[PDB]
Design a protein around this ligand. Structure first.
Ligand SMILES: [Co+2]
Ligand SMILES: [Co+2]
Ligand SMILES: [Co+2]
Ligand SMILES: [Co+2]
Ligand SMILES: [Co+2]
Ligand SMILES: [Co+2]
Ligand SMILES: [Co+2]
Ligand SMILES: [Co+2]
Lengths: 246, 245, 245, 246
């Protein structure tokens, strides 16, 4: 029961700052970095940087240097990110996640996100971007890296109302607690995620992430939809990217 | 310069018959079988049977006997299929295709199809997935195909583009048909197969079908549509999910 | 023997430019304008602008200035469109088309289109309906088109079939383009128009678009897909309906 | 408030008979014929015949002679149809409807149907058979008759959970109580129904019917679906042909 509780949605004017928070419980706060991520529907997931609470050190993705300031308060087990000189391009959902010590290791423990509304790197190509199939069938998602990342590709399942779930890391090792019908493959630049015996729960956003070097970089995302055959009885509901779910 | 020239579309009343034709040129007619397939548009493909012109032998998909009668006229190098007691469920596109008398592997030469409009058990089941997928030129996608019992390696893949005859991409799981670009590849054995297209080109966006050619009747997957992706918008939109009962 | 020969598909990174070309043959190049259109596949068509080669004049859809620059080279009878500061929303098919220097009515001669892939106010609004419809060869269907303000009679209709250039069916509401079969007819005036196809033939199943040519910028309906009907089954199946909030 | 209350669904073995009933209220029973119709999803609407309660006379469509027997009981204002020598082709929904005296006039007052499960005429081509459009837009349905029916074509809206609704009769005259955005046109063999300012209520089965001569004959039917744009919020539900709604 590692929980990251993020602060309420923010609606700010252009040019202002916002400081959003991340309250951690269920492990010793000072033992691991806190990572911060930005997500927009069009641009996907981006890594802003990490902050190490024990020591107060930070590492920033060059693209977010200056834009973001990461701090931590050891007494409250709370991490903060302040965004300054806000513009409409800063409108997104921002996530915090527990890292392992100060490693490149991807996080399996993400916060729920905070919506902010203003009013030589590894590039990864993810495909297909949208996919439809049936319960019981098997589908495959591809991710191609712009340079060799060895075997260090992770896969996430992002479902509405749940925090981001780590499926696979290091290319093919199945995360604890994930069903074996999830499997990953590849090394160097060409990777795949295969989901077999599809079930209705599997509708979600899927993302790959290289964890071979900083900055962390993500694929553009894949949306998976599941049939029901119109011969049977069922329901049709709606879900959206987290930015519109908030 | 191979033609399988098929007769024009038919618009007939229920209860009638039609005799559609398949005029072959560019190889020895009596040295090869003619296979016949039924498709309802965009949807599932089925194998009707084959006719061997030299001796007049026919083999039918059990489900199509009585419905179809296959004959050939050796003098004109034309093969025929007669459909009788037509009903609305007979409304479909019907294809002829050159058969090989040496392998189980299907041929790369199909007719353009004939449209028929009616108005006024231990077979291998093939499941294809995903049924639709969106990507961009330059990217890589992979299509899955599963057989209900082992077909060893004998799985073929086809690309259907409108206004062109069916294009054989792969047969026997991984062997590339002559003339097919190397960005296509297939793999699998027994029951689990995949077709992978890398560095997609604008022409690869199309319909795809797998087909086991390990035993008769030949059976096909339901089809996969590869469409050009639309960009994720920045405005409030919704997606769908479902659950039974 | 008219060609509008368009350059090959582009796969470019965001922020780059592309210069796509349109090589005309079969009529006097400098005696006619070149119009340019953007389409995202299957979806909405937009008019970018025109270029007159003899004097170099250009007229832009206000929404596309800065995005597009139209030029022509009279010596090679080639017209060009340069797109700059490319973004993913620029990913589309771009068409050139012969313009008339005498009427407002559009021409029947389009290029085949060029695909561009980017990765790694008082205008007349045109609403087309139904967006999809199913029928059978031999039957009759009619497509509606409504303009947000009066366009008098100046409405055109196009048939888009894959692998063929855009086909002009009707212009000015009811006038049949040369060579178009009489089972096509259009009617309407002001804001309410229809295209009616009787005795449908297998080739008429396609995408259709209306376009007002009464004022610039030229604007298009969203498109209508005419598909072959599937037969009503005798087994328990479900249909859908919806309601807001 | 003319009501036709039909008896409960029947499930019979092949070769048996069934007698289904039709209890009328809201007008004088003996003043008008009772029409009986058969509906299957594939074959559409068919006219079996009518029975005149005042006099006990019957008129049958030749195709149903022998198969159906129509009777009426004046004391109970109930009409009956007995189906004999049942086969699986007899499985359908059967409707009764109030006629006007003993005329060809189409009915605006239909019963809800009874589902039965076994375990030189004017032919009309209706097209399109399926149609999708948006609120506010306008659509057009065609019906072509095999011989001249003058102006005598009617249009019905069949919505799940409602009895069949008469929209237009005599080609173009709008039935009382129907909105003016419904309109019909044509004479001889070529007819159209036009629905403008489409609203979500308009999803239904639509059928044309010639009322120029007996036997009454119907078009094959058109299914109309209405968008909602996925940009807004809405619900998706299911409906079916009456045979599966029962
Ligand atoms: Co459904
Ligand atoms: Co539900
Ligand atoms: Co919403
Ligand atoms: Co989306
Ligand atoms: Co249905
Ligand atoms: Co929806
Ligand atoms: Co509801
Ligand atoms: Co049901």
């Amino acid at each position: 029961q590692v929980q990251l509780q993020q602060s309420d949605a923010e609606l700010v004017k252009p040019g202002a700052s916002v400081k959003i928070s991340c309250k951690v419980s269920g492990y010793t706060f000072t033992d691991h970095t806190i990572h911060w991520m930005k997500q927009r529907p069009e641009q996907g997931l981006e890594w802003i940087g990490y902050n190490y609470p024990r020591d107060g050190s930070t590492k920033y993705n060059e693209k977010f240097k200056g834009k973001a300031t990461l701090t931590a308060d050891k007494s409250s087990s709370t991490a903060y990110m302040q965004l300054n000189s806000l513009t409409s391009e800063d409108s997104a959902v921002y996530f915090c996640a527990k890292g392992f010590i100060t490693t490149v290791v991807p996080s399996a423990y993400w916060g729920q996100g905070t919506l902010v509304t203003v009013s030589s790197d590894v590039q990864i190509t993810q495909s297909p971007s949208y996919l439809a199939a049936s319960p019981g069938e098997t589908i495959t998602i591809n991710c191609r890296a712009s340079k060799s990342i060895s075997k260090y590709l992770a896969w996430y399942q992002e479902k509405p109302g749940k925090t981001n779930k780590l499926l696979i890391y290091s290319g093919s090792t199945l995360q604890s607690g994930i069903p074996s019908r999830f499997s990953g493959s590849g090394s160097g630049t060409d990777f795949t995620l295969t989901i077999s015996s599809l079930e209705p729960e599997d509708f979600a956003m899927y993302y790959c992430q290289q964890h071979n070097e900083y900055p962390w970089t993500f694929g553009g995302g894949t949306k998976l939809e599941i049939k029901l055959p119109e011969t049977g009885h069922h329901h049709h509901h709606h879900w959206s990217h987290p930015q519109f779910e908030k």
